[PDB]
Amino acid sequence: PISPIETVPVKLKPGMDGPKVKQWPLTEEKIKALVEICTEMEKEGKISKIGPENPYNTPVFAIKKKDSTKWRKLVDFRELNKRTQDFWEVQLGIPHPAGLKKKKSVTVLDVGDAYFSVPLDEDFRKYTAFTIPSINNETPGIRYQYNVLPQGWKGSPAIFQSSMTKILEPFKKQNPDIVIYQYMDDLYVGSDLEIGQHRTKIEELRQHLLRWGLTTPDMGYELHPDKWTVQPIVLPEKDSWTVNDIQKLVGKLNWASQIYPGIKVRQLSKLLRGTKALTEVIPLTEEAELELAENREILKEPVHGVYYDPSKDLIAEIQKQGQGQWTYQIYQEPFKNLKTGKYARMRGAHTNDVKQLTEAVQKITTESIVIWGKTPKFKLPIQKETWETWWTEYWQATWIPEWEFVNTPPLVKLWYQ
Amino acid sequence: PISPIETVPVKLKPGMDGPKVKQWPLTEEKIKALVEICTEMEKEGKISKIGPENPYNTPVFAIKKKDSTKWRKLVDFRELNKRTQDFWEVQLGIPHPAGLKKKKSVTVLDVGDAYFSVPLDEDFRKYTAFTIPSINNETPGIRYQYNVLPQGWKGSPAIFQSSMTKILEPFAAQNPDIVIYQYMDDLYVGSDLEIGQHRTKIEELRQHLLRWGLTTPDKKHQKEPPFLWMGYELHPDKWTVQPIVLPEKDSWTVNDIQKLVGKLNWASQIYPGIKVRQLSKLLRGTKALTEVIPLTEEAELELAENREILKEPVHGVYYDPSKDLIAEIQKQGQGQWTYQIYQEPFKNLKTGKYARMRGAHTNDVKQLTEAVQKITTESIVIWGKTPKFKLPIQKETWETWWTEYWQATWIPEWEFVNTPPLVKLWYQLEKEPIVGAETFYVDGAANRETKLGKAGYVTNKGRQKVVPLTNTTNQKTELQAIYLALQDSGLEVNIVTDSQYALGIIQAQPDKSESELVNQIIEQLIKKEKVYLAWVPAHKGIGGNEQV
Ligand SMILES: N#C/C=C/c1cccc(Oc2ccc(Cl)cc2OCCn2ccc(=O)[nH]c2=O)c1
16 A cells, blocks of 8 residues: 555564574465465565575464455464564553453454554564475475564554554544453454444444444454353262262362362361271261361352462463363462363364364463453463464464463362362 | 676674684695686686775685595685574475475486575675785785675575576476476476477576576486485385495494484385384483493394395385375384375385383373374475374274373374274273272382382271382382282272372373383283272371371
């Protein structure tokens, strides 16, 4: 299009070089799709081919977007983000509303295309370099860099922030109770309205954004954050117990003590005094029921001294509970949980583990965005190469959270369900 | 000059300057030998005699080759190389022959004087300046600099590749019928065109390259198949590795073991069944560089097996995109796995092997999954697609495992081929406590100083045992307790342990390990009809009976 004004100068923290990150091998299918997409973007001026004097590289992937049958290009900007935006969450930083999580419904719209209009600083372009790989190393890859604000770069909405504010200004005046937060390429819109009125208002915002030149490609995607809390730990309830069941109970309670220190197991541990068969039925005493009940009412009331620290990173642990169910905890420090939850989707065996874990990660990340305005670093119960191979199949989002892989779970599986 | 090729702009690293290293040395013997070079290079426009102002400098040596009739100039660019901007990396990996498509004809062209045929960015040229010295007596040295890509300069390979690509494009644009692979200096062209028109096309490419200043073989066709390339023999209808030579020695050296397992690993690409385990297990000790390392019986046996495998030549085929990609895996039994990738029954695209050398405990199913992953990765790299799998495991076994497994696992289209040995779970622990079974409360402990320690059990039937141990740790004692309870119980047994370690090893359901203890425990668990392992927190007085 045109440069409406000059470019916003982009800088890196002094003493920091550009991203150099190897490109993952891709299927011929994804390579072809990337070739088409990038050819079209090259014809539109969005990206340009570069020479060998550009050392930098950033990974690219091909995803199906959400429900669509056509390919989308997804650039992994995490490294460039760490090397730039960490100074740009200050200089250009976008404030995060603490009322968004309190709304009864939150709809997510994709505003990314808006970035393609605005030019990028000439000096900074070389840092956006990416490579379309070739099969079997037959040729060196096809190399491009961005001439416009790239999607996935956290600096893009930071630069486009003023324009977005100006565009959203009229809508906010006619709708003062609607909360609108911008995270990367997405717009989160909260309301207390009835589902129908909420969707009507969302379509109003869509048409408003559309008549101002901002296109958006929009069950549907909508959240309900008012139900989001830290789930209580549950003790198994049975008519008649056994030695084994009581052992499990004492174990789980003793584990829960690391969270809620005011738990006393002394009575339940006595209930089996001598060496006994695991299947031996032990009726609980009065003191045993007293202590179990005293440990129950203390376990349904949330912890003390748990607050979100903006300085520390968010950490999300996920464990596989079997039968399509997964449990997760979001925490800054060990044993202090900011959020916990459980995810399950759909049966029929059409689903597999990797798909479930991927959708779970996406959901947890979206929750974390709505709540704290930033993404947690995941600890994934999956083999590294497996994940790195199959994650782009089911990935529907425009952002990539940080992650690592955990090889050492204990029995904590059934303690979290 | 060589101007028609567009120069690539180059900068020095931020906050640096061209190399100022001054060289007076050394000798009069090689000096005029250097002038005889630099004159002919100056005439060809590759270098230029430079004025007195603002020079930097770089060391220059002269040296000779065998069959001495031609001398050679050598410049050490190390400092300048340190001082120049990073460039996009030249290709790290090379194309794998198993991923190449069969073409009716293949031609290998090699451009000579490659780097010297590509101009260097003007403003940067002053940093390549080198000086031919003298005997003095009021004789300032002869000064030069490069107008082209200097040999040994950091930017030369990348800029050459770029230039070659751009030069190739107007040709390849008008010739989609033929395909040109570009590797270092060499161009490998191939086509399904008839031999005559193929040859004519090759000559056209040669002339096109010659107009850009890039020389190509004028004698015969040059290389004829094979085609010994990067450690391969490339035949028209087949590919193979180089001839592999396994040396025989009385005294094996750590370096020689390195080279040995190197050649064997390389051989595993094509020759199936190669086992690298024992010979590398020797190398597990990384100590010094010169250490003479004695063989083990298993290692000599392994080397012998490999020698018998390498007895006869084996050739792999090329890839046909119209045919399915099949991968087949077999277990070698030692924790070693082997696989073949083929579109056809009697011809392999390639082969390979997988081994888990990390961690003490694992099982066959998990290892099979890992191998499948490695093969999937390799296949995506080479052919750009994932293969159909033929696996020595049954649907029930794997469904059971991955449904019971804590990690998320992924498996593609795969079918059951019944080839012994099959992959199976040798035992399964009970998910619920057994009724009518003796309950063993087991424990073990050790002194971390004396290491003596003990292991034992107390049952609900009133039975008790305490066995003293020597040279052990709390881990070993705690596992020894479970083993002890497995020995003294019936076909159905309930075990209660206070340790997360032992529970962790057993619940992982390993069928093999690096510990004889864990192995014996495995054999016992296999012999048992029902085993229920349960855990309780220690020092809580839940009926576990301990000692110190
Ligand atoms: N130095 C040295 C060469 C190195 C070299 C390395 C890689 C590829 C290459 O040649 C090829 C070039 C392009 C294509 Cl589409 C296939 C090729 O098939 C190669 C397989 N082949 C080889 C020879 C022949 O007679 N027929 C064939 O189908 C040459």
